[PDB]
Symmetry: C2
Subunit: 573 residues, 2 copies
């Protein structure tokens, strides 16, 4: 009668793998001065190994799982090589004459210990990944046998007292038919993977590993929450039928699913990822993005040491369009020239880059840039739903000149026997107070708007997004920016178009009810913000938010508008 917390429902049959380790012994014996130089070298020599061995694990994650898991190792490796650790680890040994395994443990444990003080389950899990890096470092200095979970040649079930984030990367998902551990619970990194991977697994067994030996045959019910050890065929049978039900359940659920970001009372909005690079599509899918709301094409340009030609752009766009499957990508034409220069362009310096020769102002002074790019986007639209959107729009003049441009580039494509989506929709960033002001006029001329509040805030308040000295004045949650937001949304709706938002406000927990109440159609953010905002959306009543929004829009003061938001959150969920 053994029961755990069951993190993923399902059924499985296979052999049991047991991870046996040698308790990490730490010597608290003080070292002499002559041993100070030797201990540092041992740390560097031991650190020298993990450096190369950690790199080997990274390459396996990229080929095995992809770039989504490959970069996590770079962060762990980059954090390990942090110059702060080198000076802090060496200082304690040199200053306190402590051992490298005891001194190094304090440094990584010290930071992770600070993270645990946090009162958040999400921050605590990351502290688990950081703790794992130091835990293996001690083995690396001592030189402990590395079982390595990658050396699995046969399908088996994975059983362990607890797994550290480092093992999950170099873990064979195809050869592991499930995961069973006695860790704490869902707050365990590996436990979250079972949920997302959708594979049967337990994490609160409590003491199954002490009852299982390697090569043991076990059947996981993950339905009755029971484990059969060397059971006859009468149980191997029941289970097999339990597994049938499980499979039928999928088959039935497989029909319809649910509705996207929808308030309690039925109001739907889109919620999408802003991206920079195909590589960001992974995070977007991971975080439940319903499409891409802003594809900052600059970022692709800073992903290279030369200006990407029509063809390179096309390919890059095609990949994205395809890595997005059915989903729509809003490809913004290039926005170089505020805090985002590309050095390879060698553009001249400006007194105020953010009020300078930025984005569209360049592509219009150098048509080859605008042309290659729009050409490339159009052509890529033959391969997935793309939209075109323009940055730094300031006038109706600009929009007409660029549409006219599109139309020219469209014909050329037609003439060169090159498909493009003839349906392709065109919109504009509203991220200038100009644009916001003439929103009505612009709304006749485009299919949609996305409000860039980073910029809009910047120009409306004349506060440089980069300038920490006045950051306290950078308030996208001003009665001034909100009003301009409303005015834009309304413009959209008056023409029967829609406004999205890719500025950081979309992703800001504190604006979500207002953005919603004000009728924003689409939110686009860092992928990581998608769930927080989705959550807020799913738990609001839309009508209430309207009332909230309206109130907020009448406040002459941020504080006063923050108050409304807060009393709402108090009274309303």
């Amino acid at each position: 009668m053994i029961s755990g917390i069951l993190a993923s429902p399902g059924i499985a049959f296979g052999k049991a793998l047991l991870l046996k380790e040698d308790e990490i012994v730490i010597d608290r014996k003080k070292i002499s001065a002559d041993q100070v130089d030797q201990e540092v070298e041992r740390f560097l020599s031991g650190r020298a190994k993990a450096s190369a061995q950690l790199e080997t694990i990274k390459t396996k994650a990229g080929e095995t799982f992809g770039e989504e898991k490959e970069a996590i190792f770079e962060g762990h490796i980059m954090l390990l090589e942090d110059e702060e650790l080198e000076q802090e680890i060496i200082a304690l040994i040199k200053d306190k004459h402590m051992t490298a395994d005891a001194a190094a443990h304090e440094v990584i444990e010290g930071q992770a210990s600070a993270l645990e003080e946090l009162d958040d389950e999400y921050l605590k899990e990351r502290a688990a990944d950081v703790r794992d890096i130091g835990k293996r470092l001690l083995r690396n200095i001592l030189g402990l046998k590395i079982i390595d979970l990658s050396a699995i040649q046969d399908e088996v079930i994975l059983v362990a007292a607890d797994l550290t984030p480092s093992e999950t990367a170099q873990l064979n998902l195809k050869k592991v038919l499930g995961f069973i551990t006695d860790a704490g619970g869902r707050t365990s990194q590996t436990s979250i993977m079972a949920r997302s991977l959708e594979l049967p697994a337990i994490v609160g067994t409590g003491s199954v590993t002490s009852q299982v030996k390697n090569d043991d045959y076990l059947i996981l019910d993950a339905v009755n929450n029971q484990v059969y050890v060397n059971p006859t065929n009468e149980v191997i049978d029941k289970m097999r039928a339990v597994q049938e039900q499980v499979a039928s359940e999928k088959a039935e659920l497989a029909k319809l699913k649910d509705l996207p970001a929808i308030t309690l009372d039925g109001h739907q909005v889109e919620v999408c990822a802003n991206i920079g690079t195909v590589r960001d599509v992974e995070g977007a899918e991971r975080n439940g993005a319903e499409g891409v709301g802003l594809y900052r094409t600059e970022f692709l340009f800073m992903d290279r040491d030369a200006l990407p030609t029509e063809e390179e752009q096309f390919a890059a766009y095609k990949a994205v369009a395809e890595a997005c499957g059915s989903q729509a990508v809003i490809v913004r034409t290039m926005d170089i020239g505020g805090d985002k220069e590309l050095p390879y362009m060698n553009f001249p310096k400006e007194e105020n880059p953010f009020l300078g020769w930025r984005a569209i102002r360049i592509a219009m002074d150098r048509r080859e840039i605008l042309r290659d790019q729009l050409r490339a986007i159009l052509r890529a639209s033959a391969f997935g739903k793309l939209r075109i959107m323009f940055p730094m729009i300031i006038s109706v003049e600009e929009v007409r000149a660029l549409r006219k441009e599109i139309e020219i580039y469209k014909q050329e494509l037609r003439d060169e026997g090159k498909a493009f989506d003839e349906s392709i929709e065109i919109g504009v960033m509203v991220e200038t107070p100009a644009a916001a002001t003439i929103a009505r006029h612009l709304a006749k001329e485009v299919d949609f708007f996305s409000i860039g509040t980073n910029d809009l805030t910047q120009y409306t308040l004349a506060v440089d997004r980069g300038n920490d000295m006045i950051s306290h004045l950078y308030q996208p949650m001003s009665p001034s920016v909100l009003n301009l937001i409303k005015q834009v949304i309304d413009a959209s709706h008056a023409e029967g178009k829609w406004t999205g938002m890719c500025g950081e406000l979309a992703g800001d927990e504190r604006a979500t009810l207002l953005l919603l109440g004000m009728g924003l159609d689409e939110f686009s953010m860092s992928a990581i913000s998608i769930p927080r905002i989705k959550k807020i959306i799913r738990n609001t009543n839309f009508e209430d938010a309207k009332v909230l929004a309206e109130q907020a829009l009448a406040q002459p003061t941020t504080d006063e508008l923050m108050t409304l938001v807060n009393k709402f959150i108090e009274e309303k969920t």
Copy 2:
């Protein structure tokens, strides 16, 4: 029976002064190479004199007339020392082997000749002042006797074929009872002075100087347009009575006057000067300013090599308040930090000064600055009508924090037995799209607004006022900026306050009908623009302008809005 054009009506009795000169002879004899080095030295040696002699005339103008006439000489002297003249004068002598008096004449004549090609009477007169500088230079190289009009010990009438701007400066106004010349007409610089000086004078005599000898006694009717030469007492009498009528005319007119900038149909606005320094009050009075609409106090701060203390500021403000007589000055608190740094502050660099730590953002981070200044303004208000206005306002928060500040500084003054105008009105620059957006809210909190369109344009369009590369996008005459202007004016009026404008649009001939139609209460500009705009205002019908304004505000395009303005100007005056 001699008749001229009569530039100023009046009567006068006195001796006649005759300016006799020796025709300037120019040698067209080519010089040899050995003479090239000698001719340059002669030019430098001759130029060396005029350098010191011109400086002497400047000092007489400052003490005699004031700073208004002292700076005109600096421009003439600064232009003469222009490095372009040194290279061009020397190049022709060295390259064409020409004489210094013949080569130098071509350089000054060449530029003045280009100015005459202009089709404007105002630009042509300035070409007369530049021509005068080169005319005297030829005498300075030759070394011609200088009668000097400053050597007058007895009251006399001034008679000459024509006077060059240079003579008008070193001219004794108190010892000259009038001016008579046979020049071309009002297009003559000296002719304008008779109008502004309000003294009897003729400029189209045609040939009076050839009929008058120095020391001749002449009576100027300037009423019957006749001159009596050595006439009996019967005419010296009639005239004396004519002069009586003239004096009574003044006495009667001396009652009331007229109305300020008023459209044909009775709509009045204020029209004022923006200033930097007491010294600008002169230009303001000169150009018919009805008060000062913006006293950029920064400029006073850049008039010094140290931060001006409370006391220095007070004095500076007091002077202005007093140099303005009955007139109101709108003293703006200090606006340092976009393109206007004061080097002595050694502030650190910013990535976007114009979106940085500017104006009020400083005075609020360093109260001593705000305090000294507001203290000084208040105290100066005990001495003339002053208003306080704040730059770079972005929120209602900012305004309340600063009013609260005023109130504290007010009490301190009360407690130190220091008068200040308890009536003192407080307003804000609306030059941020934030301010423009929350204009309604701000209007409850201040007594007035002045729209800074230089900045407002800048932030609304995100185009740096400094950046020539994108200057073509800097359009204060956008449907976006105009709308925001309207919205501000309306805010004012809704609270029963008023909006003025000190941005350059106020002074822009092309906005005047719109600004007017949109109900702007007050215009403030460079003094030099006051008459052009006054003229436009005085010749419009206000109702028509409203209609114009309204139309313009609906245009989605600048061009389209320029068209309205133009068809107006065509059809309406």
